[PDB]
């Protein structure tokens, strides 16, 4: 309880002083790393890259749905995750922080329904790491 | 485990505008940045496989000898990470699992009553964020 915090938090300070020297702390350690890594990327690349309490997962799903037009990749899953991630910042600057939590759970709908049989046949976010990193 | 990747991309996303996920989020964070800062700081400023919870416990004893900060509970949490990639680097990764776990030992011994007395981890964030000036 007030232990497992600091628990968390050991091992998140540990997890980024490992990083820091091109060591890891655990594998989703590494998958971390490599997904924040990747998506500052993307951000950078595509710099020149519409959320209300209304919005359906519909809505959503469309949007992402023209992002794997052609087809999963692992590029391409990382302009999901960089997609959701610019719908929670808008919403925050927006001043609807509430629907971060909403974002979140449609990120994890579409991964589960579309992406996560992709990810398995292509030898998981272990392969991502190999990849990327 | 896609949750947890999920939250940890957006936590990541939202602060890097100032923004939080969550309170524990926000410390994480602070801690990240205020060991990188205490890091370059007390930059060249700067354990055994049998190596007891007492050998640490009594180096860090000397870190808080004048007593319990902010500065030096950052000081803690920088020693501890010096000390796993030391073992790393050592090839003694054993080690970095015990590290963690003498760290949460001390902070649930001996820092977590100061931490709540001096207005728990959100007080540290407050004060840290602050600090960081232009
Ligand atoms: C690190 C990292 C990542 C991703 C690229 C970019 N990339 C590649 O270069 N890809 C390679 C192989 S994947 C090789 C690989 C392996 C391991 C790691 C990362 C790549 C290729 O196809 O040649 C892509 O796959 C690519 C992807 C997307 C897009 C693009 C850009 C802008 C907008 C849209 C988009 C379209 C429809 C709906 C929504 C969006 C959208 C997305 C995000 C936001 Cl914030 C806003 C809108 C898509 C363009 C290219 C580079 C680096
Ligand atoms: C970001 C951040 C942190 C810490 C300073 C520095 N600081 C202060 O600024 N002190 C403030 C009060 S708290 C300021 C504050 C408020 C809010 C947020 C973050 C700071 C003051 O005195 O006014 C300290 O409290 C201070 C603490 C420690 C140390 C020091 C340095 C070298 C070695 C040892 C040490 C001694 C014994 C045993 C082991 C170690 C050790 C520690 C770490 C490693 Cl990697 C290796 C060895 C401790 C020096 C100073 C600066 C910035």
Redesign the pocket.
């Given at each position: 309880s007030m232990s497992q915090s600091n628990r968390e938090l050991v091992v998140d300070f540990l997890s980024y002083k490992l990083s820091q020297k091109g060591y890891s702390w655990s594998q989703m350690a590494a998958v971390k790393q490599a997904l924040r890594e990747?998506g500052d990327?993307?951000?950078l690349?595509?710099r020149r890259?519409h959320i209300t309490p209304g919005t359906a997962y519909q809505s959503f799903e469309q949007?992402?749905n023209?992002?794997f037009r052609d087809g999963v990749?692992?590029?391409?899953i990382?302009?999901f995750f960089?997609?959701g991630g610019?719908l929670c910042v808008e919403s925050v600057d927006k001043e609807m922080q509430v629907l971060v939590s909403r974002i979140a759970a449609w990120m994890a709908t579409y991964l589960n329904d579309h992406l996560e049989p992709w990810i398995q046949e292509n030898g998981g976010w272990d392969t991502?790491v190999e990849?990327?990193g």
């Open positions: 990747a990327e993307f951000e690349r595509y890259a949007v992402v023209e992002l990749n692992w590029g391409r990382v302009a960089s997609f610019a991502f990849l990327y």
